Amino acid sequence: HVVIGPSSLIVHFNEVIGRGHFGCVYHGTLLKIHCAVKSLNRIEVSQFLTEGIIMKDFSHPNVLSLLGICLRSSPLVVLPYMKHGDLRNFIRNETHNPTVKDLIGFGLQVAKGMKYLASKKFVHRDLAARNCMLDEKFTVKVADFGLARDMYDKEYYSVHNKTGAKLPVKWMALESLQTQKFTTKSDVWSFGVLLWELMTRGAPPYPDVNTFDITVYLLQGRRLLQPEYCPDPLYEVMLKCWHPKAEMRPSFSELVSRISAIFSTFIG
Ligand SMILES: C[C@@H](c1ccc2nccn2c1)n1nnc2ncc(-c3cnn(C)c3)nc21
């Protein structure tokens, strides 16, 4: 059910709608549904289809789904069209003016998406507002995973010298920075940074810090500041997300409960 016949898909290669390190994203027509088509030519087949099957089994309103894969004599990843693009660029856009309730709602949507993924035992490893997207109905979808996974904004990835890996250090949990071990509990840390990103309308975290300098920074007893219009219990939620002990951080289930409680207190 993952494979799409070439006959069924029209790829508008002339107009590029996204740029990733592994390949570009183009406007697409799947037969008459509108879609986004990610190419991989900018870079195992058995693990590729396996990744596709897993991604298709994921069905939740706040998780970017897989429409399918097209095989051309590099394979094309077919994803639903996201009218408002990535969450970070949206909240950064001057033409849009989301309220504080709106921003909390966008965070609650990510938590709902992540609660779903964590229950399937799927660890994202690169959660950040730049890696979530919005469709026409303003539905946030946890994206940039499985076959859609890439480096969409290279500015926020530092290369480890002893490993050679591109790491999103300003979103990484303390243990991931020291041991390169990622779990659901480290995705929870990254969720706290996403919460901060939303409440500041896409400001870059720790502007005063330079790459792997971040580890000593956090070990000095430092955390991101409370943004101006961020409610006190929302900042309390973030602080819990950045707990030094992973096992002391809230689950995404707890996060859905606490954020929806904060969200219900706003009129509009
Ligand atoms: C494959 C790509 C994607 C998916 C759907 C879509 N509709 C319109 C454009 N689209 C791009 N994609 N999938 N997950 C992503 N996460 C993030 C980004 C992205 C692109 N630019 N920036 C800054 C982030 N792109 C992502």
Curated annotation (Swiss-Prot):
Positions of region (Interaction with RANBP9): 134-268
Active-site residues, Swiss-Prot/TrEMBL: D126 (proton acceptor)
Result of changing V25I: In RCCP; constitutive autophosphorylation
Binding site for ATP: I17, G18, R19, G20, H21, F22, G23, C24, V25, K38
Topological domains annotated Cytoplasmic: 1-268
Every Protein kinase domain range: 11-267
Consequence of substituting M172T: In RCCP; somatic mutation
Tissue expression notes: Expressed in normal hepatocytes as well as in epithelial cells lining the stomach, the small and the large intestine. Found also in basal keratinocytes of esophagus and skin. High levels are found in liver, gastrointestinal tract, thyroid and kidney. Also present in the brain. Expressed in metaphyseal bone (at protein level).
Effect recorded for Y152C: In RCCP; germline mutation
Recorded disease: Activation of MET after rearrangement with the TPR gene produces an oncogenic protein. Defects in MET may be associated with gastric cancer.
General function of this protein: Receptor tyrosine kinase that transduces signals from the extracellular matrix into the cytoplasm by binding to hepatocyte growth factor/HGF ligand. Regulates many physiological processes including proliferation, scattering, morphogenesis and survival. Ligand binding at the cell surface induces autophosphorylation of MET on its intracellular domain that provides docking sites for downstream signaling molecules. Following activation by ligand, interacts with the PI3-kinase subunit PIK3R1, PLCG1, SRC, GRB2, STAT3 or the adapter GAB1.
Oligomeric form and interacting partners: Heterodimer made of an alpha chain (50 kDa) and a beta chain (145 kDa) which are disulfide linked. Binds PLXNB1. Interacts when phosphorylated with downstream effectors including STAT3, PIK3R1, SRC, PCLG1, GRB2 and GAB1. Interacts with SPSB1, SPSB2 and SPSB4. Interacts with INPP5D/SHIP1. Interacts with RANBP9 and RANBP10, as well as SPSB1, SPSB2, SPSB3 and SPSB4. SPSB1 binding occurs in the presence and in the absence of HGF, however HGF treatment has a positive effect on this interaction. (Microbial infection) Interacts via extracytoplasmic residues 25-656 with L.monocytogenes InlB; MET can bind HGF, its endogenous ligand, and InlB simultaneously. InlB probably dimerizes upon binding to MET, which encourages subsequent dimerization of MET.
Annotated protein name in UniProt: Hepatocyte growth factor receptor
Gene encoding the protein: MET
Coverage span on the entire protein: 1068 to 1346 of 1390
